[PDB]
Amino acid sequence: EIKTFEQFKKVFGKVYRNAEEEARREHHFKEQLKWVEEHNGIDGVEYAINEYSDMSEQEFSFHLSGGGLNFTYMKMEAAKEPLINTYGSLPQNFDWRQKARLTRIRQQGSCGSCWAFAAAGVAESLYSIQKQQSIELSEQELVDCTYNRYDPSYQCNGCGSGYSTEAFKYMIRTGLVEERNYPYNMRTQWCDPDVEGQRYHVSGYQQLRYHSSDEDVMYTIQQHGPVVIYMHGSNNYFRNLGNGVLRGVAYNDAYTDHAVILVGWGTVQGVDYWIIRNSWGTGWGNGGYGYVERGHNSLGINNYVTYATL
Ligand SMILES: *[C@@H]1O[C@H](CO)[C@@H](O)[C@H](O)[C@H]1NC(C)=O
Ligand SMILES: [Cl-]
Ligand SMILES: [Cl-]
């Protein structure tokens, strides 16, 4: 129910370092609100304003990944082959939200940390799935302690941009303490390594072949749990997604700037979709979850799929 800027301002409590900045800012909100009203309900899909609606597509994309994702680096670590192709048949519907008590939806806020939330999310899922333990891990510890300037053995850039594979690497070698012990501030800080508290590890991770088939991905999800994917988060349709199944968007997209989690799949009246766990609060999508059509590498969903192992 946000009709122009300072309802948006007081709802999301936005402070502006300047008056020059606000002028450049409600125009983007107006044109984002413009995009929302003209698209809401089309193809029976809900779109809606959110905390990010004051940035342009260019700005938001930079907000997510600081224009600095080395795809060459990301492609090099992938498996080179599809899965051994002997797994039987796949169920039409599969939803880890129903097979396990997954942890609550998180909110990365004004920090390009999706890579950290996606990795932590997969790890938390696995602890629920294999041990029936609900834990909340510290994304902030990932942001700071995989920071390249802090530890050159890692390639992440904090709130700038990052790699979920690098995050899992950290979860193997060091492990993460819980949120309580290293709380989230949506900013790059100096790594605190003398944080005590129990540490939660994974033992391994594997990135699937670039452009993996839906079937490989679905099977991976079935056998290894929720998976990290990298996709085109700053796309207008995905950006403002509420309820509904996003169809016909960005087929075979090569441009990726956002990390999220696949937790399953389903079919609704002829339409095959993915279930996406996002890190933008329960206000986005349907309670923080979104639905994107399968079968077309929509928004680059199949480009960089990674699972982990406890
Ligand atoms: C990207 O990564 C590749 C392989 O790790 C490296 O050779 C290249 O120099 C990197 N480029 C940039 C711009 O970081
Ligand atoms: Cl390692
Ligand atoms: Cl920062």
mmCIF file of C-alpha atoms and ligand atoms in Angstrom:
data_model
loop_
_atom_site.group_PDB
_atom_site.id
_atom_site.type_symbol
_atom_site.label_atom_id
_atom_site.label_comp_id
_atom_site.label_asym_id
_atom_site.label_seq_id
_atom_site.Cartn_x
_atom_site.Cartn_y
_atom_site.Cartn_z
ATOM 1 C CA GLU A 1 0.000 0.000 0.000
ATOM 2 C CA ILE A 2 2.783 2.422 -0.982
ATOM 3 C CA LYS A 3 1.537 5.112 -3.372
ATOM 4 C CA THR A 4 4.491 7.564 -3.493
ATOM 5 C CA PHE A 5 7.825 8.358 -1.825
ATOM 6 C CA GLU A 6 7.498 9.267 1.844
ATOM 7 C CA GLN A 7 5.109 6.465 2.615
ATOM 8 C CA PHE A 8 7.923 4.374 1.177
ATOM 9 C CA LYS A 9 10.290 6.522 3.261
ATOM 10 C CA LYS A 10 8.573 5.934 6.589
ATOM 11 C CA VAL A 11 7.767 2.278 5.852
ATOM 12 C CA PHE A 12 11.406 1.433 5.109
ATOM 13 C CA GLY A 13 12.813 4.201 7.309
ATOM 14 C CA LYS A 14 15.258 5.529 4.748
ATOM 15 C CA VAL A 15 17.832 8.122 5.780
ATOM 16 C CA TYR A 16 19.499 10.141 3.030
ATOM 17 C CA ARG A 17 22.956 11.640 3.473
ATOM 18 C CA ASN A 18 21.838 14.534 1.302
ATOM 19 C CA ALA A 19 18.984 16.427 -0.330
ATOM 20 C CA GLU A 20 20.797 16.042 -3.681
ATOM 21 C CA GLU A 21 20.518 12.289 -3.218
ATOM 22 C CA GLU A 22 16.778 12.246 -2.523
ATOM 23 C CA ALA A 23 16.008 14.176 -5.714
ATOM 24 C CA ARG A 24 17.814 11.551 -7.810
ATOM 25 C CA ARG A 25 16.055 8.959 -5.685
ATOM 26 C CA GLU A 26 12.269 9.372 -5.770
ATOM 27 C CA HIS A 27 12.444 9.504 -9.549
ATOM 28 C CA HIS A 28 13.757 5.946 -9.477
ATOM 29 C CA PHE A 29 11.021 5.102 -6.983
ATOM 30 C CA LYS A 30 8.374 6.754 -9.165
ATOM 31 C CA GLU A 31 9.546 4.895 -12.274
ATOM 32 C CA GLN A 32 9.821 1.683 -10.203
ATOM 33 C CA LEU A 33 6.308 2.316 -8.906
ATOM 34 C CA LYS A 34 5.375 3.045 -12.498
ATOM 35 C CA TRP A 35 6.804 -0.323 -13.606
ATOM 36 C CA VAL A 36 4.948 -2.090 -10.778
ATOM 37 C CA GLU A 37 1.467 -0.736 -11.467
ATOM 38 C CA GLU A 38 1.750 -1.349 -15.217
ATOM 39 C CA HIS A 39 2.899 -4.941 -14.703
ATOM 40 C CA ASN A 40 1.001 -6.049 -11.586
ATOM 41 C CA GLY A 41 -1.364 -8.905 -12.369
ATOM 42 C CA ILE A 42 -0.106 -9.474 -15.905
ATOM 43 C CA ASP A 43 -0.112 -13.203 -16.697
ATOM 44 C CA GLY A 44 -1.547 -13.580 -13.201
ATOM 45 C CA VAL A 45 1.686 -12.558 -11.490
ATOM 46 C CA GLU A 46 1.886 -10.137 -8.588
ATOM 47 C CA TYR A 47 4.553 -7.415 -8.525
ATOM 48 C CA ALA A 48 5.244 -5.013 -5.641
ATOM 49 C CA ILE A 49 7.452 -2.223 -4.310
ATOM 50 C CA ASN A 50 10.116 -3.207 -1.781
ATOM 51 C CA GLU A 51 13.070 -1.828 0.206
ATOM 52 C CA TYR A 52 15.162 -1.646 -2.967
ATOM 53 C CA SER A 53 12.609 0.170 -5.153
ATOM 54 C CA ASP A 54 14.488 3.463 -4.957
ATOM 55 C CA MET A 55 17.407 2.273 -7.107
ATOM 56 C CA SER A 56 17.644 1.931 -10.876
ATOM 57 C CA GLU A 57 18.326 -1.459 -12.452
ATOM 58 C CA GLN A 58 21.958 -0.414 -12.876
ATOM 59 C CA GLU A 59 22.222 0.693 -9.213
ATOM 60 C CA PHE A 60 20.457 -2.333 -7.686
ATOM 61 C CA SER A 61 22.639 -4.700 -9.711
ATOM 62 C CA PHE A 62 25.682 -2.868 -8.312
ATOM 63 C CA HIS A 63 24.112 -2.986 -4.833
ATOM 64 C CA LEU A 64 23.892 -6.790 -5.175
ATOM 65 C CA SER A 65 27.321 -7.584 -6.629
ATOM 66 C CA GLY A 66 29.353 -4.378 -7.089
ATOM 67 C CA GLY A 67 29.739 -5.149 -10.785
ATOM 68 C CA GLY A 68 32.508 -7.569 -9.875
ATOM 69 C CA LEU A 69 31.600 -11.217 -10.442
ATOM 70 C CA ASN A 70 34.535 -13.023 -12.132
ATOM 71 C CA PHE A 71 32.587 -15.539 -14.267
ATOM 72 C CA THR A 72 35.868 -16.941 -15.571
ATOM 73 C CA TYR A 73 36.733 -17.815 -11.975
ATOM 74 C CA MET A 74 33.239 -19.275 -11.415
ATOM 75 C CA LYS A 75 33.228 -21.410 -14.597
ATOM 76 C CA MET A 76 36.647 -22.930 -13.855
ATOM 77 C CA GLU A 77 35.494 -24.637 -10.651
ATOM 78 C CA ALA A 78 32.382 -26.309 -12.129
ATOM 79 C CA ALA A 79 32.090 -30.009 -12.922
ATOM 80 C CA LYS A 80 32.760 -30.539 -16.653
ATOM 81 C CA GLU A 81 30.232 -33.345 -17.176
ATOM 82 C CA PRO A 82 26.526 -33.893 -16.472
ATOM 83 C CA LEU A 83 25.574 -36.310 -13.684
ATOM 84 C CA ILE A 84 25.944 -40.004 -14.429
ATOM 85 C CA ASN A 85 22.599 -40.362 -16.157
ATOM 86 C CA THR A 86 21.171 -43.429 -14.514
ATOM 87 C CA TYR A 87 18.852 -42.017 -11.860
ATOM 88 C CA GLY A 88 15.331 -43.322 -12.399
ATOM 89 C CA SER A 89 12.326 -41.021 -12.517
ATOM 90 C CA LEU A 90 11.705 -37.791 -10.645
ATOM 91 C CA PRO A 91 8.586 -36.942 -8.647
ATOM 92 C CA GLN A 92 6.449 -34.224 -10.224
ATOM 93 C CA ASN A 93 6.605 -32.172 -7.002
ATOM 94 C CA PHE A 94 9.326 -31.867 -4.402
ATOM 95 C CA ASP A 95 9.500 -29.187 -1.701
ATOM 96 C CA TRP A 96 12.102 -29.266 1.097
ATOM 97 C CA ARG A 97 9.860 -26.792 2.991
ATOM 98 C CA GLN A 98 7.470 -29.708 3.507
ATOM 99 C CA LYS A 99 10.038 -32.442 4.083
ATOM 100 C CA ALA A 100 11.953 -30.525 6.717
ATOM 101 C CA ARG A 101 11.588 -27.542 8.977
ATOM 102 C CA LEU A 102 13.732 -25.075 7.074
ATOM 103 C CA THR A 103 14.956 -21.992 8.867
ATOM 104 C CA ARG A 104 13.151 -18.667 8.699
ATOM 105 C CA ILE A 105 13.588 -16.283 5.795
ATOM 106 C CA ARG A 106 16.500 -13.845 6.233
ATOM 107 C CA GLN A 107 17.045 -10.287 4.998
ATOM 108 C CA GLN A 108 20.421 -9.164 3.607
ATOM 109 C CA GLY A 109 19.393 -5.486 3.493
ATOM 110 C CA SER A 110 21.770 -2.866 2.093
ATOM 111 C CA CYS A 111 24.710 -5.237 1.594
ATOM 112 C CA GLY A 112 25.754 -7.376 -1.371
ATOM 113 C CA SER A 113 25.902 -10.500 0.757
ATOM 114 C CA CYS A 114 23.494 -12.837 -1.088
ATOM 115 C CA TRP A 115 26.387 -15.231 -1.650
ATOM 116 C CA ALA A 116 26.812 -15.522 2.131
ATOM 117 C CA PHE A 117 23.067 -15.977 2.866
ATOM 118 C CA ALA A 118 22.707 -18.606 0.129
ATOM 119 C CA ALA A 119 25.579 -20.712 1.436
ATOM 120 C CA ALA A 120 24.487 -20.326 5.060
ATOM 121 C CA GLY A 121 20.934 -21.204 4.018
ATOM 122 C CA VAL A 122 21.972 -24.457 2.366
ATOM 123 C CA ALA A 123 24.086 -25.339 5.441
ATOM 124 C CA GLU A 124 21.246 -24.593 7.842
ATOM 125 C CA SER A 125 18.905 -26.712 5.656
ATOM 126 C CA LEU A 126 21.263 -29.668 5.837
ATOM 127 C CA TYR A 127 21.456 -29.474 9.657
ATOM 128 C CA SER A 128 17.666 -29.514 9.772
ATOM 129 C CA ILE A 129 17.400 -32.307 7.209
ATOM 130 C CA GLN A 130 20.114 -34.640 8.577
ATOM 131 C CA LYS A 131 20.123 -33.801 12.282
ATOM 132 C CA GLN A 132 16.748 -32.111 12.939
ATOM 133 C CA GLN A 133 18.699 -29.178 14.374
ATOM 134 C CA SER A 134 17.565 -25.617 13.747
ATOM 135 C CA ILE A 135 20.536 -23.269 13.726
ATOM 136 C CA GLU A 136 21.031 -19.720 12.593
ATOM 137 C CA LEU A 137 24.528 -19.195 11.232
ATOM 138 C CA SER A 138 26.469 -15.927 11.038
ATOM 139 C CA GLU A 139 26.422 -14.458 7.528
ATOM 140 C CA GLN A 140 28.453 -11.565 8.942
ATOM 141 C CA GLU A 141 31.351 -13.892 9.771
ATOM 142 C CA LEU A 142 31.345 -14.951 6.112
ATOM 143 C CA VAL A 143 31.259 -11.324 4.967
ATOM 144 C CA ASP A 144 34.272 -10.368 7.040
ATOM 145 C CA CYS A 145 36.426 -13.427 7.223
ATOM 146 C CA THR A 146 36.328 -14.480 3.567
ATOM 147 C CA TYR A 147 37.102 -10.861 2.705
ATOM 148 C CA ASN A 148 40.028 -10.959 0.243
ATOM 149 C CA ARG A 149 41.854 -8.033 1.904
ATOM 150 C CA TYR A 150 41.685 -9.870 5.240
ATOM 151 C CA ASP A 151 42.563 -13.362 4.030
ATOM 152 C CA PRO A 152 43.979 -13.562 0.460
ATOM 153 C CA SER A 153 43.329 -17.323 0.459
ATOM 154 C CA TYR A 154 39.664 -16.351 -0.141
ATOM 155 C CA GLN A 155 38.248 -14.486 -3.143
ATOM 156 C CA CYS A 156 35.167 -12.735 -1.685
ATOM 157 C CA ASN A 157 34.555 -8.993 -1.465
ATOM 158 C CA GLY A 158 32.266 -8.671 1.572
ATOM 159 C CA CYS A 159 29.245 -6.501 0.871
ATOM 160 C CA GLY A 160 30.800 -5.823 -2.520
ATOM 161 C CA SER A 161 30.300 -9.221 -4.097
ATOM 162 C CA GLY A 162 31.114 -12.828 -3.296
ATOM 163 C CA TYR A 163 31.050 -16.519 -4.049
ATOM 164 C CA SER A 164 28.988 -19.085 -2.209
ATOM 165 C CA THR A 165 31.649 -21.684 -3.100
ATOM 166 C CA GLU A 166 34.178 -19.599 -1.216
ATOM 167 C CA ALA A 167 31.709 -19.447 1.671
ATOM 168 C CA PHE A 168 31.385 -23.248 1.826
ATOM 169 C CA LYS A 169 35.187 -23.446 1.678
ATOM 170 C CA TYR A 170 35.247 -21.326 4.825
ATOM 171 C CA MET A 171 32.620 -23.582 6.376
ATOM 172 C CA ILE A 172 34.938 -26.549 5.805
ATOM 173 C CA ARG A 173 38.230 -25.132 6.958
ATOM 174 C CA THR A 174 37.024 -22.909 9.810
ATOM 175 C CA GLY A 175 33.280 -23.358 10.336
ATOM 176 C CA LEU A 176 30.734 -20.670 11.254
ATOM 177 C CA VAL A 177 29.534 -19.637 14.701
ATOM 178 C CA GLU A 178 25.860 -18.852 15.245
ATOM 179 C CA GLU A 179 24.249 -15.490 14.578
ATOM 180 C CA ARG A 180 24.154 -14.762 18.348
ATOM 181 C CA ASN A 181 27.922 -14.715 18.565
ATOM 182 C CA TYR A 182 28.699 -12.745 15.397
ATOM 183 C CA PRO A 183 25.587 -10.653 14.550
ATOM 184 C CA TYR A 184 24.664 -9.231 11.125
ATOM 185 C CA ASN A 185 25.248 -5.504 10.475
ATOM 186 C CA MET A 186 24.936 -5.469 6.660
ATOM 187 C CA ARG A 187 28.418 -3.981 6.268
ATOM 188 C CA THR A 188 31.971 -5.149 5.696
ATOM 189 C CA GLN A 189 33.829 -5.315 9.006
ATOM 190 C CA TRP A 190 37.192 -6.476 10.245
ATOM 191 C CA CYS A 191 37.108 -10.239 10.735
ATOM 192 C CA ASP A 192 36.959 -11.384 14.304
ATOM 193 C CA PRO A 193 38.544 -14.858 14.416
ATOM 194 C CA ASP A 194 38.648 -15.118 18.250
ATOM 195 C CA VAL A 195 34.882 -15.443 18.389
ATOM 196 C CA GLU A 196 34.036 -18.454 20.469
ATOM 197 C CA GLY A 197 30.801 -20.381 20.363
ATOM 198 C CA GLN A 198 30.205 -23.706 18.732
ATOM 199 C CA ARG A 199 31.259 -23.842 15.075
ATOM 200 C CA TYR A 200 29.236 -25.522 12.366
ATOM 201 C CA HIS A 201 31.016 -27.003 9.365
ATOM 202 C CA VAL A 202 30.228 -28.702 6.133
ATOM 203 C CA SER A 203 32.699 -31.308 4.830
ATOM 204 C CA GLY A 204 32.502 -30.590 1.110
ATOM 205 C CA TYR A 205 30.676 -28.959 -1.766
ATOM 206 C CA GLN A 206 30.365 -29.448 -5.517
ATOM 207 C CA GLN A 207 29.426 -27.030 -8.266
ATOM 208 C CA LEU A 208 27.476 -28.593 -11.105
ATOM 209 C CA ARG A 209 28.285 -28.284 -14.824
ATOM 210 C CA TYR A 210 27.559 -24.863 -16.385
ATOM 211 C CA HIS A 211 24.097 -24.937 -17.997
ATOM 212 C CA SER A 212 23.086 -28.065 -16.093
ATOM 213 C CA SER A 213 19.846 -29.679 -17.173
ATOM 214 C CA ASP A 214 16.754 -29.173 -15.012
ATOM 215 C CA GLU A 215 16.788 -32.915 -14.368
ATOM 216 C CA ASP A 216 20.364 -32.908 -12.986
ATOM 217 C CA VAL A 217 19.460 -29.960 -10.774
ATOM 218 C CA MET A 218 16.229 -31.600 -9.531
ATOM 219 C CA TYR A 219 18.029 -34.834 -8.827
ATOM 220 C CA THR A 220 20.845 -32.949 -7.027
ATOM 221 C CA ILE A 221 18.214 -31.195 -4.912
ATOM 222 C CA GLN A 222 16.567 -34.513 -4.135
ATOM 223 C CA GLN A 223 19.816 -36.303 -3.176
ATOM 224 C CA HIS A 224 21.947 -33.515 -1.689
ATOM 225 C CA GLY A 225 19.402 -31.005 -0.334
ATOM 226 C CA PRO A 226 18.741 -27.326 -1.162
ATOM 227 C CA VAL A 227 21.266 -25.855 -3.588
ATOM 228 C CA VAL A 228 22.818 -22.425 -4.193
ATOM 229 C CA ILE A 229 22.167 -20.921 -7.602
ATOM 230 C CA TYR A 230 23.368 -17.699 -9.205
ATOM 231 C CA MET A 231 20.915 -15.753 -11.267
ATOM 232 C CA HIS A 232 19.856 -12.376 -12.613
ATOM 233 C CA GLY A 233 18.356 -10.872 -9.451
ATOM 234 C CA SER A 234 18.281 -7.261 -10.686
ATOM 235 C CA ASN A 235 15.896 -8.124 -13.548
ATOM 236 C CA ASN A 236 12.720 -6.030 -13.110
ATOM 237 C CA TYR A 237 10.331 -8.983 -13.014
ATOM 238 C CA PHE A 238 12.373 -10.982 -10.531
ATOM 239 C CA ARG A 239 13.170 -7.812 -8.555
ATOM 240 C CA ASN A 240 9.544 -7.014 -7.813
ATOM 241 C CA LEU A 241 8.180 -10.554 -7.747
ATOM 242 C CA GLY A 242 5.313 -11.292 -5.363
ATOM 243 C CA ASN A 243 2.857 -14.184 -5.763
ATOM 244 C CA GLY A 244 2.615 -16.137 -9.032
ATOM 245 C CA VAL A 245 4.809 -18.057 -11.460
ATOM 246 C CA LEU A 246 7.277 -15.932 -13.378
ATOM 247 C CA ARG A 247 7.107 -17.144 -16.980
ATOM 248 C CA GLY A 248 8.893 -16.036 -20.150
ATOM 249 C CA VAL A 249 11.658 -14.040 -18.462
ATOM 250 C CA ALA A 250 15.278 -13.900 -19.656
ATOM 251 C CA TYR A 251 15.649 -17.300 -21.281
ATOM 252 C CA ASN A 252 19.225 -18.641 -21.120
ATOM 253 C CA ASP A 253 20.422 -15.521 -19.288
ATOM 254 C CA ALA A 254 24.218 -15.207 -19.105
ATOM 255 C CA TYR A 255 24.091 -12.245 -16.725
ATOM 256 C CA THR A 256 24.135 -13.170 -13.067
ATOM 257 C CA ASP A 257 24.365 -10.858 -10.013
ATOM 258 C CA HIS A 258 22.381 -12.553 -7.261
ATOM 259 C CA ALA A 259 22.800 -15.763 -5.267
ATOM 260 C CA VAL A 260 19.740 -17.609 -3.926
ATOM 261 C CA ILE A 261 18.611 -21.150 -3.032
ATOM 262 C CA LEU A 262 16.499 -23.744 -4.844
ATOM 263 C CA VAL A 263 14.510 -25.728 -2.317
ATOM 264 C CA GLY A 264 12.374 -27.658 -4.775
ATOM 265 C CA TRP A 265 10.041 -27.746 -7.733
ATOM 266 C CA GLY A 266 6.470 -28.301 -8.743
ATOM 267 C CA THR A 267 3.880 -28.031 -11.493
ATOM 268 C CA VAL A 268 0.800 -25.847 -11.369
ATOM 269 C CA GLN A 269 -1.746 -26.353 -14.147
ATOM 270 C CA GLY A 270 0.665 -27.196 -16.958
ATOM 271 C CA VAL A 271 3.419 -24.886 -15.734
ATOM 272 C CA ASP A 272 6.651 -26.361 -14.327
ATOM 273 C CA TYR A 273 8.403 -24.095 -11.787
ATOM 274 C CA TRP A 274 11.331 -23.811 -9.420
ATOM 275 C CA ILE A 275 10.939 -22.913 -5.745
ATOM 276 C CA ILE A 276 13.414 -20.166 -4.861
ATOM 277 C CA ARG A 277 14.428 -19.213 -1.344
ATOM 278 C CA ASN A 278 15.487 -15.567 -1.438
ATOM 279 C CA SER A 279 17.159 -13.355 1.203
ATOM 280 C CA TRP A 280 15.076 -10.178 0.858
ATOM 281 C CA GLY A 281 12.682 -10.637 3.778
ATOM 282 C CA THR A 282 9.217 -12.184 3.901
ATOM 283 C CA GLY A 283 7.914 -9.106 2.085
ATOM 284 C CA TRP A 284 9.282 -10.316 -1.271
ATOM 285 C CA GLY A 285 7.662 -13.026 -3.380
ATOM 286 C CA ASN A 286 5.354 -15.272 -1.363
ATOM 287 C CA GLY A 287 6.614 -15.069 2.221
ATOM 288 C CA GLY A 288 10.163 -14.657 0.899
ATOM 289 C CA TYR A 289 9.873 -17.501 -1.611
ATOM 290 C CA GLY A 290 9.475 -17.092 -5.366
ATOM 291 C CA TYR A 291 8.362 -19.248 -8.258
ATOM 292 C CA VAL A 292 10.128 -19.258 -11.622
ATOM 293 C CA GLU A 293 9.224 -21.380 -14.636
ATOM 294 C CA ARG A 294 11.559 -24.314 -15.406
ATOM 295 C CA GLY A 295 12.707 -25.544 -18.806
ATOM 296 C CA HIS A 296 14.477 -22.470 -20.156
ATOM 297 C CA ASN A 297 17.421 -21.576 -17.921
ATOM 298 C CA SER A 298 15.281 -18.601 -17.047
ATOM 299 C CA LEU A 299 17.397 -15.787 -15.586
ATOM 300 C CA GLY A 300 20.453 -18.101 -15.594
ATOM 301 C CA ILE A 301 19.093 -20.323 -12.792
ATOM 302 C CA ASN A 302 20.933 -23.351 -14.238
ATOM 303 C CA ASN A 303 24.278 -21.587 -14.739
ATOM 304 C CA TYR A 304 25.963 -22.058 -11.361
ATOM 305 C CA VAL A 305 24.354 -24.636 -9.153
ATOM 306 C CA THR A 306 26.256 -25.779 -6.062
ATOM 307 C CA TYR A 307 25.408 -28.319 -3.382
ATOM 308 C CA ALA A 308 27.147 -29.039 -0.082
ATOM 309 C CA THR A 309 27.806 -32.101 2.043
ATOM 310 C CA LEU A 310 27.847 -32.450 5.836
HETATM 311 C C1 LIG B 1 39.337 -13.930 -13.032
HETATM 312 O O1 LIG B 1 39.757 -15.230 -12.616
HETATM 313 C C2 LIG B 1 40.667 -15.850 -13.536
HETATM 314 C C3 LIG B 1 40.873 -17.272 -13.072
HETATM 315 O O2 LIG B 1 40.824 -17.378 -11.656
HETATM 316 C C4 LIG B 1 41.956 -15.041 -13.580
HETATM 317 O O3 LIG B 1 42.874 -15.661 -14.478
HETATM 318 C C5 LIG B 1 41.645 -13.620 -14.018
HETATM 319 O O4 LIG B 1 42.831 -12.832 -13.947
HETATM 320 C C6 LIG B 1 40.559 -12.995 -13.134
HETATM 321 N N1 LIG B 1 40.166 -11.699 -13.654
HETATM 322 C C7 LIG B 1 39.705 -10.701 -12.884
HETATM 323 C C8 LIG B 1 39.339 -9.437 -13.599
HETATM 324 O O5 LIG B 1 39.593 -10.823 -11.668
HETATM 325 CL CL CL B 2 38.581 -26.669 0.817
HETATM 326 CL CL CL B 3 30.401 -1.870 3.833
#
